[PDB]
Amino acid sequence: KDIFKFKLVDQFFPFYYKNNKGEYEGLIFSILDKWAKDNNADIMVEHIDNLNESEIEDEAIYLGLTYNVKLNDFFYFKSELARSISILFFKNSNFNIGVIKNTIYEDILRLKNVNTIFLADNSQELVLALKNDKVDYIYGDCKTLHYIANNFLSEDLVIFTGDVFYSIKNRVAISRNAPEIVKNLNLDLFSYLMK
Amino acid sequence: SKDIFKFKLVDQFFPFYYKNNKGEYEGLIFSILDKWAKDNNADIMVEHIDNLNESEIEDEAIYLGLTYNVKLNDFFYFKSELARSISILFFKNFNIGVIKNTIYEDILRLKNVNTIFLADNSQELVLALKNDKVDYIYGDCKTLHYIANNFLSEDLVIFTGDVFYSIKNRVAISRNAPEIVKNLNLDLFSYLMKMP
Ligand SMILES: [Mg+2]
């Protein structure tokens, strides 16, 4: 009956990602299908590389966003998916650090007064920036960035051992101007992972 | 007197600790443990072990990389949560491989899987898949995938079927541990600063 739009942002292993062979992978559809049946509804899935405040769809449910001062004005963050850990990577003095824009990782670097921040639109772009030595470090998701890096880089990634490790919540997000029916949805997708 | 405590890092646990190409251990756990050490006014010793041998269990040691298991529960007390994982059935491009004495083993026995191949550690487990000793492996989503992808040039495929459990990774100490260890606050996760 009802049809709800889900938006997958960038990449988020293991929920959704692009493998070495360029094939879209993930178990998110398995979860969304189960959520759909429980809610007696159909779903539309859209994938977006980078989020823009001007292109926000009020009725859509966003996955793969993290808390960000800019995005907080537009979104309500609800149920948690898997958690992540922020890591600063470099390839195996003055410097510059790559980071995906409008993410919690950007805000972390900003409040640390890092002024040589290189803003990438997505994970792939960020990794390629490191490849072509546009940046000396990249900052972001522990597994997803490491994974994409190993797909494009010939050099191994190394972890920068400093005070840069934070526990990151990856939550489901809806527009603050979402219809009441969306706002009343149970969006605890993580509950479909029994324990 | 500043106390000294031994931490045993079992197998591999991405991104807390894992093997790189140089035969060394990379990870962020070492940073966390140094922080924990400062607040508890103590020194620390880190030792890596691939397998968990009952004969080699040290009562004074604090164990990381263990999950709740019917067999280990009779030897360890599982304490604070360090991180979470998702159980995934992996395959390349029917017997199932799984690390012995893990929560993952129990799951397969509860689901009444007939042909269970037991591995001692993640490295052995993923090697069994690579060498076609097993058709599927079951375990940690990040770690098993990392090893296969970085050491064996194998990008493992996730089994779509309903086999996804939320797994808690906890700190564990021996049942016969010293009183000085039992009194420790082993909330290592708290030393990972949270978002606001
Ligand atoms: Mg596929």
From TrEMBL, chain A:
Subcellular locations according to the entry: Cell membrane
Residues annotated as binding Mg(2+): 25
Whole sequence portion shown: 27 to 234 of 1494
Source domain of life: Bacteria
Protein source organism: Borreliella burgdorferi (strain ATCC 35210 / DSM 4680 / CIP 102532 / B31)
Protein name: histidine kinase
